[PDB]
Amino acid sequence: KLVIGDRSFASRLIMGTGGATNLAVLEQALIASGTELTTVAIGLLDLLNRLGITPLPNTAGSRSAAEAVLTAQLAREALNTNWVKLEVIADERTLWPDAVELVRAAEQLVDDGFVVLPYTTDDPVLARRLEDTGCAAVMPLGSPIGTGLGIANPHNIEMIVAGARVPVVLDAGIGTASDAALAMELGCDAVLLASAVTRAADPPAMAAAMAAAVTAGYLARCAGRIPKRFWA
Amino acid sequence: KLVIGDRSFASRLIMGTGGATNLAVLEQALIASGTELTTVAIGLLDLLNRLGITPLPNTAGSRSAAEAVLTAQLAREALNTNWVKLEVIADERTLWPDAVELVRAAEQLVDDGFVVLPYTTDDPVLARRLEDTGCAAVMPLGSPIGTGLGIANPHNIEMIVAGARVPVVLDAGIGTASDAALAMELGCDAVLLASAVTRAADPPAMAAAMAAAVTAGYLARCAGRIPKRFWA
Numbered sequence A, B: 001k002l003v004i005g006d007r008s009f010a011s012r013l014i015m016g017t018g019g020a021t022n023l024a025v026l027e028q029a030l031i032a033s034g035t036e037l038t039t040v041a042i043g044l045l046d047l048l049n050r051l052g053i054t055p056l057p058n059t060a061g062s063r064s065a066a067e068a069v070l071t072a073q074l075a076r077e078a079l080n081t082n083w084v085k086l087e088v089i090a091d092e093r094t095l096w097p098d099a100v101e102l103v104r105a106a107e108q109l110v111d112d113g114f115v116v117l118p119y120t121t122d123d124p125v126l127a128r129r130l131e132d133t134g135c136a137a138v139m140p141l142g143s144p145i146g147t148g149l150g151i152a153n154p155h156n157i158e159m160i161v162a163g164a165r166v167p168v169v170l171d172a173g174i175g176t177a178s179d180a181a182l183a184m185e186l187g188c189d190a191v192l193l194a195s196a197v198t199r200a201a202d203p204p205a206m207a208a209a210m211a212a213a214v215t216a217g218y219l220a221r222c223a224g225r226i227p228k229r230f231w232a
Ligand SMILES: CC(=O)[C@@H](O)[C@H](O)COP(=O)(O)O
Pocket: A015, A016, A017, A018, A039, A058, A060, A085, A087, A144, A145, A146, A147, A148, A171, A172, A173, A174, A192, A193, A194, A195, A196
């Protein structure tokens, strides 16, 4: 099973709610995804409560460590959870992580008793630093948020998996089911996605597709695939 | 649902038995795959009968139209089915189709009342010729049999899907779950595979992975994925 912090999860698909068009369709999509853990940018909380899904407060849009830390502290007080998806962004065109401010925020939040899940790049040194800092997982992006471009650098994901001692979550840029299966085949422990489902023409169908895709890639990873060969 | 010939199938995963190491593991893998249709090279038939799976006799190893036609006629008489997976191979290094002899065999077998499912290349003119001949599906290879290389030419698969009026089955070269999901995302109606499961370290786990992968890619195809964009 997937173990992060003090929790064991039956599903390796972590949903985000970014892009959600309306609560009734989001409800159907969350049920179809089978998720147990859903990120919410600090109606929606009530919905997660009614569905039995654990909220994961996220510091989306934070531009500095100070801003992220303060956002997380307000959420912990209001929502009674010490889990946080830590997002510190340098740029609005790219929604690219600010690595310097990310590590500073993670240090502060780990020292303050949070279970920290950081949105990070595919840099393997930065992933080892976030793990050494005390993050409960590391979540390298596949491609920038909302682009649907899939896993741009499978080799760096494999490098992060090789050097990790906490779960590795592929966390941004998924566009379709084969991308999520590939993440698991590369050795990720989980996939976090939002746009591919919330902006699909049929979000509940795409959520069911991603639940199946994460299962498919995890089973294929475990089952020992055949080698590639040049001749038949 | 998937309709081929006079049949409607609840599963879009078609299993092959090539590479099977022993009948007891093959049984567990066929159950886990959820398949309704399994190819058998002309014990094993009894197993398909006990599982409720429809056999698809195949002319594997045939090197000429005459050899394939004769093999199919013997199978129809012995097995009481007019369905056939038509395979005519030019080369043992490549197991590459012989297009000339394939079309000749398909003409003869369609004229003799068979439901013909041809193993073909990714040539879009040859796929239109096999459909015009009267084949009940066309089954373009992803990569050569048993290589595990996946879908070598997604653009030609998309060309075949665009110009087809019978189901398109991706039929060879699958290596892992994301390959089968991709086939469905490109618009194939079904996936046929054998080696990726029968030669996996854990064939029943890999069969469950492929059932999930085919479901995942079909739902993603139907659900209207997000466009790719350069900036977040
Ligand atoms: C929690 C995080 O802020 C994500 O939900 C982000 O939206 C995911 O990226 P995609 O939208 O590209 O899946």
